[model samples]
Target: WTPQRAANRLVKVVEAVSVAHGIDRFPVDVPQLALECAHIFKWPDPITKVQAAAIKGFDGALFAGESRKEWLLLYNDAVTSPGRMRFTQAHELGHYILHRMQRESFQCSDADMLNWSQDERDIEAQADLFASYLLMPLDDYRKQVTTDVDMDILGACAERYGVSLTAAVLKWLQYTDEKAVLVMSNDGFINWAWSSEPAARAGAFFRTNVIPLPEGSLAANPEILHDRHGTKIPATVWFPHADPHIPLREMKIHAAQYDATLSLLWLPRSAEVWPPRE
Candidate 1:
């Protein structure tokens, strides 16, 4: 099955089990349960705590016997967080379930796990989809928040999911049809920005990393990024590429430990890009 399809399938399995076990079942908490499910299937030892296994050989490897299989997730242990550990375990589980017969050993690095667009034999996006669905089942998510939701309300859902604010926002973006953009920046430069389909079609999204931020851009101001949570600025402040007078909703998340900032820009449903004159 395709990666997206696999993700959908896995989410259903997780939801079925969750419904039977009464596991709080909203947003699957993938890291917590991927290993748990593996344990249930008798493939590997259950990871009770988030810890890194020693990397005697490579970053990602799977151990298997005649009928036994287990994944060895390697990380520095020092640089890893619960979120990273959970993601790694879910990724290794992906290898176990999907690729055990084709390959035996899989070694990966941090870059391998993060580069979702890379076209390796094992795609990170597929693994991420597995983890995301395993943790946050879309069926449960829809029950939590109906289709019509603002960023402020979505922030509450993020807390419910026990993921980073960025993750919560991305999760919503994955399903929503509205024009939106998620910008992650550091210092004063935009590291990356993801645009919703509608936003991309409307040309309301910015790809400043390749072209550079336009003059007097709000993202150019460090103070704006440092503003308090739930800060809403004029649309022109950050979305200067859109109509100068149009307003957009902006939410800021500053992670001091990571030394980075995130911005969520939500454009109204009516927002659209104007075509050039003939």
Candidate 2:
């Protein structure tokens, strides 16, 4: 089965279980769900324990027992953020459910955990997709925020889903109709960027493979205070090739730990127009 199909099936089971027990399923009990689902499905080796320990260079792992009748989930105890820990656990659970039979042991890093690209079909990307769908099902997520949602609302969804703000925004971008883009930068250079479907289709995006932030863009402004809520700026500041009359709402958050900045650009819904030849 595809990753989406597998995750949707599990979510259906979770919904049934939640309805039966009359419990709220906001913060998914990933550990308990892993154990119970394994038991219910009668997998050859069910996950027997979920533990945390100092794991270097990796967010989580899944190991098969010597007898092959049991499995273990290990998450990095060094991770201080509860939201990150939860995501790690869910990611490991994804490996257990989707890829366990294919491999005996799995080690995952930060890149593996954050990968949500639909075009990639590698095991790591599949596991990430499973975790994202299982933890924040799109059907339930859309009810929390619409396509035109702002950073504040996205942050609230993050809190509600017990995931990071970046994760929440990425999830929103997955299905939003709004023309939006998310740019991650460090030291006044673009590390990477993702655009919503509409934005990409409308030619509103950045090629940040090795590109520097625009000279006058908020991401390049060291003196500007970090604006979590967002501020208005000319769209041309970021996309000089686009019509100068358009405007974009820019929101930025500085992550001290990573020495990186996360910028979200909300472009107006109107179709973008190109500059005329000089």
Candidate 3:
């Protein structure tokens, strides 16, 4: 089965179990689910423990005994945020359920953790997809924050789902109809950016490959610490070639730990199309 198919099946099972037992399934008990489901779902070897330790470089890992009768999941104890730790555990659980039969041990680094979608590292991407779907079911997530909402709503959903704001925003981008773009930067340069389908189709995006953040953009302003909601900015500030009349809602969040800033740009529905087609 595909990674999404596997995750959907597991999510359905989890949802059914939650409904049956009258349990609030938010912030999925990944460790408990990994262990219990492995035992009940006919995996010969079940995860014995989900522990934390000082793991260097790697964010999470999975190990199994030589006999393959018992398994253990380990996450970097150094990670401060409970939400991040939860994601790491869920990521490892994905490996156990999806990739363990192929390999006895798996180690994941920070880059691996963030590789939610990439063709080169298909396994890691699959695991990330599994974790994302398992933790944040689409149906429930849609009810919490619709496509037209701002970052504040997504932040609230992140809190409710016990996921990082980045994770929450990425998930929102997956299904939102609004033309939107998310850009991550540090110092004065852009690291990466993701565009929603509408935004991509409308040619509202940033190519961060050796590109610097625009001078007047919110991300380039160090004085403004953060903006939970957003502020309207002339769209030309972000897309210099765009029509000056168009405006964008810009939201900024600074991650102190990573010394990075996240910017979300929500474009107006009526913005002029780039590279006009005849």
Give the Cα-based TM-score of candidate 1 against the true structure. Answer: 0.71
lDDT of 1 by residue, 1-278 (tens): 45556566667676677788888655455544555655554545433343366554334444554444444444434444544455556666666556655765566665445434324355555665565655556766677667555555666765566544555566666677888887777666676676777777777766543444434545555666443234445566655445666767666667432356766777877776554557
Model 1 lDDT at residue 196: 74
Residue pairs whose backbone atoms clash in candidate 3: none
TM-scores, each model vs. reference: 0.71, 0.89, 0.88
Ranking by TM-score: 2, 3, 1
Q: Which candidate is the best by TM-score?
A: 2
**Tens-digit lDDT track of model 2 for 75-128:** 886844666778888888878877787888999987677666776458887787
lDDT, residue 154, model 1: 65
Worst window of 10 by summed lDDT in candidate 1:
111-120
* Inter-residue clash pairs, candidate 2: none
lDDT of 1: 0.58
Backbone clashes in model 2: 0
